[PDB]
């Protein structure tokens, strides 16, 4: 199926994103390594 | 030139992850796998 | 911890999404690699 996403958040402790999904119970996510950093 | 993403949807079996993006005819996409679970 | 992505945009010609995220000055982003094409 294709999997809608709900919503995103990001750690920089973690240095992962975090994909909310709709989809069963509610409490599915996506989970990927990113780069996070202070722009100038 | 960054454009937005209008879209992410993620795939039941693969979870790779696809974000529709605002440009031009509006097929582009941008693609990337991820981990899919289950939390608290 | 968790903090809100508020934008993501990706870049045709870097190949990378970036995040942009709701937290201190607001200069914070998050940025990952992304294979980036045109559909069917
Ligand atoms: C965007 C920020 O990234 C790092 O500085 C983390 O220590 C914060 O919790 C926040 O996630």
Same mark, same amino acid.
């Given at each position: 199926?294709?999997?809608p996403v709900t919503k995103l958040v990001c750690d920089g402790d973690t240095y992962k994103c975090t994909a909310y999904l &709709?989809? +069963? &119970? +509610?409490? *599915?996510?996506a989970q *990927? &390594? @990113?780069?996070?950093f202070? @722009? @100038?």
């Open positions: 199926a294709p999997v &709709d989809y +069963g &119970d +509610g409490k *599915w996510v *990927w &390594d @990113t780069a996070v202070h @722009t @100038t």
